[PDB]
């Protein structure tokens, strides 16, 4: 089912974000083809990601029920970072291509690089770890991290793993979503440093924040504050909408009136760092066998020891 | 006590090629001279450790290959019973070291292959530790700088295959300051 | 970009998507009409936006009759009160190199790495203008009087030499300017097109956030930088 993405696009231009009116309508027509092609329950505009000569346009596709060293293995079906299937379009009119699923630590803990997107799925990523697969896997991993650290709902929208929409949500004011960051809560699950959203015991039991936590408790980074709250229509503040603005991910926004909400990202798909991108360090060099009593050549018995053994 | 099913000289010492079983568990089936190990010889251990190479004066001096039971393996030069000279070392998970050795100590110029990555660490090795002039080669880029203790220490020079010489110093042990210059090279 | 491109809403159609609001579109139209009134500039361009933490920076630039003259850039926060930024020297350029961190807002902010926020804004503005400002082929005509004027018979760039990259110059002191093929490093420009061959999109990668639109058949050009306010030296790691 198509969401109201044109009035959400008018909300984007009210916040100043967006591809333009005709390009957002063109993305809406491409999403209409995507909904008419595949049995999709929810197909909303996740956003678009800039590249070198082509840009990726991403859809949050959720299908219908039943229709369509040690290695930590992948999620089975519709759990964790693989909850929403992502479809990628270059320019609308060209057919959408299905992305693969996010795998654990072989992909997520080998993601720790800074790389521009080249606009093609079948492009090798040559960096400090060998990234498995082509650029589609790195795009999918970046989309998973932006979904984990960007998709942010107002407080009271969902009841607390999974979540359902709240029918008793009376709504929250626009001015209450600007002065306080505790009134915004995260939509989907946090990606663990292991590489998943649910912890797998390799036989530590490390955990992150729960599903519906305020984003004031997860505020980064170092000395600067993430999730800049600004008021578009500052001139006429009675009908303003609160425009969230993530500084950890540049180009990431969330929106009020607060009775409903939409999430949008457009950028280069990169996490901002206050310093420069330090490369990941090489693994420490393996030592040899410790030269001790065990690894030692004996100097053999001599003729005095032989004559001691002969009369024995 | 040990046995010796080989040949002895006119005095009584072990001389020439002959099998020998050491009393503590090891054995040796190589060549003997003046009651000491000399020449090409095989030395088995109590476990599956193995040395097949040259001996001089009851000491490993020459080109020979050593097998360790944990998975590490050395082929190359030996001298004075410790690692000395050019040689190739593989570690327990195919980590490949081809370089100099001083005295069991991994010295000189040495190429370190991180086979889980494919990246190369070549440059100056001091006392089993990454210290000196270094060139951390990767697949499409390399770091021409200086290492102190398994980490870069100071001013570096980053070579990229797309044609840029990034200048940047290490202001800390972990972080990197990319200031100030990027040069065409 | 001029106010004519502010009328067509061409920042969103370039595809960068950080864009501008009809709030700020009407505010830049009236306020840049005021900037052309009070200061006698030949042309006034909305330079772009510097991304903030407590307030948003809005930057516009004015030019004299000489098109390569040192510009009198201006800044505004509430998009009506435009105020003249001082010119930048090299002493202020190497001063702000010890400060690494996001642009905050509230221009009397002080950095402990003192160093004023306005000096950082002005030096960052001169760095972006000296590095990734863009002029196409035949847009500027070098007059023999010693000044530079807008070429008013500028036919737009044909589709054969859009992708060379040898048909785009810099909007500063040096077909009499320095081309894009000598930029360090090579490949630091995102070469792109819009729907059809109606607009050519150039995005700087030494500064993530500047977008250059160019219609290949009409005299429509200009650069807008809306973005982080930082020079990433991580760019060789990206390519």
Swiss-Prot record, chain A:
One of its GO terms (biological process) is radial spoke assembly. The keyword Cytoplasm applies. It is found in: Cytoplasm, Cytoskeleton, Cilium axoneme. Disruption phenotype: Mice show hydrocephalus and the tracheal and ependymal cell cilia show clockwise rotation motion instead of planar beating. All three types of radial spoke heads (RS1, RS2 and RS3) are missing in the tracheal cilia. Keywords: Cell projection, Cilium, Cilium biogenesis/degradation, Cytoplasm, Cytoskeleton, Phosphoprotein. Expressed in the trachea, ependymal cells and oviduct (at protein level). Abesent from sperm (at protein level). Expressed in brain, kidney and testis. GO terms for cellular component: 9+2 motile cilium; axoneme; extracellular region; radial spoke; radial spoke head; radial spoke head 1; radial spoke head 2; radial spoke head 3. Component of the axonemal radial spoke 1 (RS1) and 2 (RS2) complexes, at least composed of spoke head proteins RSPH1, RSPH3, RSPH9 and the cilia-specific component RSPH4A or sperm-specific component RSPH6A, spoke stalk proteins RSPH14, DNAJB13, DYDC1, ROPN1L and NME5, and the RS1 complex-specific anchor protein IQUB. Interacts with RSPH1. Interacts with RSPH3B. Interacts with RSPH6A. Interacts with RSPH9. Functions as part of axonemal radial spoke complexes that play an important role in ciliary motility. Essential for triplet radial spokes (RS1, RS2 and RS3) head assembly in the motile cilia. Belongs to the flagellar radial spoke RSP4/6 family. This is Radial spoke head protein 4 homolog A. It comes from Mus musculus (Mouse). The lineage of its organism: Eukaryota, Metazoa, Chordata, Craniata, Vertebrata. The gene is Rsph4a. The chain holds residues 310 to 693 of 716 of the full protein.
Curated annotation (Swiss-Prot), chain B:
One of its GO terms (biological process) is epithelial cilium movement involved in extracellular fluid movement. GO terms for cellular component: 9+2 motile cilium; axoneme; condensed nuclear chromosome; cytoplasm; extracellular region; meiotic spindle; motile cilium; outer dense fiber. Expressed in the trachea, ependymal cells, oviduct and ependymal cells (at protein level). Germ cell specific. Specifically expressed in testis, and to a lower extent in ovary. Not expressed in somatic tissues. Residues 1-25 are annotated as: Disordered. Keywords: Cell projection, Chromosome, Cilium, Cytoplasm, Cytoskeleton, Flagellum, Meiosis, Repeat. Its main location: cytoplasm. Signal peptide: none annotated. MORN repeats lie at residues 4-27, 28-50, 51-73, 74-96, 97-119, 143-165. The keyword Transit peptide does not apply. Residues 5-15 have a biased composition (Basic and acidic residues). It is found in: Cytoplasm; Chromosome; Cytoplasm, Cytoskeleton, Cilium axoneme; Cytoplasm, Cytoskeleton, Flagellum axoneme. Functions as part of axonemal radial spoke complexes that play an important part in the motility of sperm and cilia. Component of the axonemal radial spoke 1 (RS1) and 2 (RS2) complexes, at least composed of spoke head proteins RSPH1, RSPH3, RSPH9 and the cilia-specific component RSPH4A or sperm-specific component RSPH6A, spoke stalk proteins RSPH14, DNAJB13, DYDC1, ROPN1L and NME5, and the RS1 complex-specific anchor protein IQUB. Interacts with RSPH3B. Interacts with RSPH4A. Interacts with RSPH6A. This is Radial spoke head 1 homolog. It comes from Mus musculus (Mouse). The lineage of its organism: Eukaryota, Metazoa, Chordata, Craniata, Vertebrata. The chain holds residues 17 to 201 of 301 of the full protein.
Curated annotation (Swiss-Prot), chain C:
This is Radial spoke head protein 9 homolog. One of its GO terms (cellular component) is 9+2 motile cilium. PANTHER family: MITOCHONDRIAL RIBOSOMAL PROTEIN S18, RADIAL SPOKE HEAD PROTEIN 9 HOMOLOG. It is found in: Cytoplasm, Cytoskeleton, Cilium axoneme; Cytoplasm, Cytoskeleton, Flagellum axoneme; Cell projection, Kinocilium. Belongs to the flagellar radial spoke RSP9 family. Functions as part of axonemal radial spoke complexes that play an important part in the motility of sperm and cilia. Essential for both the radial spoke head assembly and the central pair microtubule stability in ependymal motile cilia. Required for motility of olfactory and neural cilia and for the structural integrity of ciliary axonemes in both 9+0 and 9+2 motile cilia. Keywords: Cell projection, Cilium, Cilium biogenesis/degradation, Cytoplasm, Cytoskeleton, Flagellum. The gene is Rsph9. Component of the axonemal radial spoke 1 (RS1) and 2 (RS2) complexes, at least composed of spoke head proteins RSPH1, RSPH3, RSPH9 and the cilia-specific component RSPH4A or sperm-specific component RSPH6A, spoke stalk proteins RSPH14, DNAJB13, DYDC1, ROPN1L and NME5, and the RS1 complex-specific anchor protein IQUB. Interacts with IQUB. Interacts with RSPH3B. Interacts with RSPH4A. Interacts with RSPH6A. Interacts with CFAP61. Interacts with LRRC23. GO terms for biological process: axonemal central apparatus assembly; axoneme assembly; cilium movement; epithelial cilium movement involved in extracellular fluid movement; flagellated sperm motility; mating; radial spoke assembly. Expressed in the testis, trachea, lung, oviduct and ependymal cells (at protein level).
């Amino acid at each position: 089912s198509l969401p109201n993405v044109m009035e959400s696009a008018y909300y984007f231009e009210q916040a100043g974000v967006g591809l333009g009116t005709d390009e957002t309508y063109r993305v809406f027509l491409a999403l209409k083809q995507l909904t008419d092609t595949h049995p999709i329950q929810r197909c909303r505009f996740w956003g678009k990601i800039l590249g070198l000569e082509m840009n990726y346009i991403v859809a949050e596709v959720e299908f219908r029920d039943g229709e369509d060293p040690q290695v930590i293995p992948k999620e089975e079906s519709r759990t964790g970072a693989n909850k929403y299937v992502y479809f990628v379009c270059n320019v609308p009119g060209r057919p959408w291509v299905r992305l693969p699923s996010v795998t654990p630590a072989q992909i997520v803990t080998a993601r720790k690089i800074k790389k521009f997107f080249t606009g093609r799925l079948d492009a090798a990523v040559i960096s400090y770890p060998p990234f498995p697969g082509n650029e589609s896997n790195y795009l999918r991993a970046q989309i998973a991290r932006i979904s984990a650290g960007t998709h942010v709902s107002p407080l009271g929208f969902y009841q607390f793993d999974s979540y359902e929409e709240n029918p008793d949500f009376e709504g929250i004011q626009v001015i209450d979503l600007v002065e306080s960051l505790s009134n915004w809560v995260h939509h989907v699950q946090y990606i663990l440093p292991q590489g998943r959203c649910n912890w797998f015991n390799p036989i530590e039991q490390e955990v992150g924040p729960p599903l519906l936590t305020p984003i004031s408790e997860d505020l980064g980074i170092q000395n600067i504050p993430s999730w800049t709250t600004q008021l578009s229509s500052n001139l006429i503040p009675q009908y303003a909408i609160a425009v969230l603005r993530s500084n950890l991910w540049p180009g990431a926004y969330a929106f009020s009136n607060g009775k409903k909400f939409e999430n949008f990202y457009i950028g280069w798909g990169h996490k901002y760092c206050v310093e420069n991108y330090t490369p990941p360090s090489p693994p420490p060099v393996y030592q040899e066998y410790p030269s001790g009593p065990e690894i030692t050549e004996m100097n053999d018995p001599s003729v005095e020891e032989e004559q001691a053994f002969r009369m024995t | 006590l040990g046995e010796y099913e080989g040949e002895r000289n006119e005095v009584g010492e072990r001389h020439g090629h002959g099998k020998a079983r050491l009393p503590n568990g090891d054995t040796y089936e190589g060549s003997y001279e003046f009651g000491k190990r000399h020449g090409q010889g095989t030395y088995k251990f109590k476990n599956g450790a193995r040395y097949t190479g040259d001996y001089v004066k009851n000491k490993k001096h020459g080109q020979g290959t050593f097998i360790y039971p944990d998975g590490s393996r050395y082929e190359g030069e030996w001298a004075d019973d410790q690692r000395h000279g050019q040689g190739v070392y593989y570690y327990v998970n195919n980590d490949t070291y081809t370089g100099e050795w001083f005295n069991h100590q991994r010295h000189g110029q040495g190429t370190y292959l991180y086979a889980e990555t494919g990246s190369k660490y070549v440059g100056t090795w001091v006392h089993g530790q990454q210290e000196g002039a270094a060139e951390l080669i990767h697949l499409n880029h390399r770091y021409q700088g200086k290492f102190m203790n398994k980490n870069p220490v100071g001013p570096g020079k980053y070579v990229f295959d797309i044609g840029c010489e990034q200048h940047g110093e290490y202001r800390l042990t972990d972080t990197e300051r990319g200031e100030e210059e990027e040069e065409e090279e | 970009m001029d106010a004519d491109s502010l009328l067509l809403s061409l920042e969103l159609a370039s595809g960068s998507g950080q864009g501008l609001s009809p709030d700020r579109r009407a505010s830049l139209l009236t306020s840049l009409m005021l900037v052309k009134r009070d200061y006698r500039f030949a042309r006034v361009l909305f330079w772009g936006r510097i991304l903030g933490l407590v307030a948003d920076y809005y930057i516009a630039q004015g030019l004299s009759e000489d098109q390569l003259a040192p510009r009198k850039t201006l800044y505004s926060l509430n998009c009506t009160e435009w105020s003249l930024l001082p010119p930048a020297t090299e002493e202020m350029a190497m001063q702000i190199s010890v400060v690494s961190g996001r642009f905050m807002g509230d221009p009397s902010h002080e950095y402990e790495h003192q160093i004023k926020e306005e000096t950082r804004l002005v030096s960052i503005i001169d760095q972006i203008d000296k590095a990734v400002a863009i002029i196409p082929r035949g847009a500027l005509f070098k007059t023999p009087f010693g000044v530079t004027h807008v070429n008013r018979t500028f036919e737009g760039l044909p589709l054969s030499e859009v992708r060379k990259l040898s048909s785009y110059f810099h909007f500063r002191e040096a077909d009499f300017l320095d081309s894009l093929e000598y930029d360090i490093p090579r490949g630091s420009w995102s070469i792109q097109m819009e729907r059809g061959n109606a607009l050519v999109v150039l995005r700087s990668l030494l500064w993530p956030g500047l977008t250059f639109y160019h219609a290949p058949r009409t005299k429509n050009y200009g650069y807008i930088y809306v973005g982080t306010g930082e020079k990433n030296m991580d760019l060789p790691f990206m390519l």
